[PDB]
Amino acid sequence: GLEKTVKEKLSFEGVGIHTGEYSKLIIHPEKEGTGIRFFKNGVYIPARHEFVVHTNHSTDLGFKGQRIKTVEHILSVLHLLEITNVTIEVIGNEIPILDGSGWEFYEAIRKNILNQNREIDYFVVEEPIIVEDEGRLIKAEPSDTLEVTYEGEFKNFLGRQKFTFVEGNEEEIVLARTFAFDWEIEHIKKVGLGKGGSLKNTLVLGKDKVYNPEGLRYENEPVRHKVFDLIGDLYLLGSPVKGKFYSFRGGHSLNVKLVKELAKKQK
Ligand SMILES: CC[C@H](C)[C@H](NC(=O)c1ccc(C#CC#Cc2ccc(N)cc2)cc1)C(=O)NO
Numbered sequence: 001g002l003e004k005t006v007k008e009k010l011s012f013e014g015v016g017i018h019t020g021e022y023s024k025l026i027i028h029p030e031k032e033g034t035g036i037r038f039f040k041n042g043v044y045i046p047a048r049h050e051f052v053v054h055t056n057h058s059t060d061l062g063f064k065g066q067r068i069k070t071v072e073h074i075l076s077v078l079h080l081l082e083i084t085n086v087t088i089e090v091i092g093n094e095i096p097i098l099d100g101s102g103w104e105f106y107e108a109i110r111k112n113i114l115n116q117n118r119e120i121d122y123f124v125v126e127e128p129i130i131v132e133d134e135g136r137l138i139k140a141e142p143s144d145t146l147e148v149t150y151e152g153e154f155k156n157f158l159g160r161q162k163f164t165f166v167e168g169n170e171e172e173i174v175l176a177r178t179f180a181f182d183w184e185i186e187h188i189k190k191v192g193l194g195k196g197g198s199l200k201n202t203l204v205l206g207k208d209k210v211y212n213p214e215g216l217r218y219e220n221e222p223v224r225h226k227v228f229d230l231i232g233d234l235y236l237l238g239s240p241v242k243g244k245f246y247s248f249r250g251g252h253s254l255n256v257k258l259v260k261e262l263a264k265k266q267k
């Protein structure tokens, strides 16, 4: 496809899932060739792997002492819509979690797409590659389209699950919420994560139940969300991606490890 930006400024506001702090986003149009970058306190922070500064339960970006937490969801939506040139101005310390999924971002941005002149410079996976970490694995291989599978194993009623995204089916993942398990709640709070979490923005799972009043959106919503996360982390390659991906129990750390190896292999 062709490069894209937004037709006009868009803003989003709300609590961040981990900080519990209120923040605001303003998405600014940019011309062809600009790329995706964040902006905070006078500092531009490109949405690229070189600027990743944390990968524990979220992907955080930083530069010159300016940090932005949890970029993976907004990046995933921008990757799926192939928005290639914007500046995401951030006031605060974290991207708002909103409903827990990509939906509100997706809905608003989809309505405001502006086509540009330049052909997208896709990052094309050119040969098989695999990264591993003690029973976690991500592999990639060449493909003309973006296809992403995540397979997980959960110590509850979900059991082993997997989902495959194929180009054109973004509605099957953009509403999958971020999630947490009830037995991990005490820990994540002790280490200061999930301070903004609630049943209004997080799928909370138990041994044989879901805490949320509305329950699961899909029987395999958590692995759908993991696919959504991986597509967000893949956009740290610096442009939309063409390849077939399989992640077994991968997290943001392994996701970014894959991106870094792909970048290193290309050069
Ligand atoms: C690694 C992938 C993972 C899914 C990740 N999400 C998280 O790490 C995560 C960790 C903790 C929470 C939380 C909370 C809470 C609550 C709460 C609710 C109701 C009551 N009554 C009380 C408390 C949410 C998300 C993610 O999406 N990354 O992109």
Ligand SMILES: [Zn+2]
Residues within 6 Å of the ligand: 072, 073, 178, 225, 229
């Ligand atoms: Zn996520």
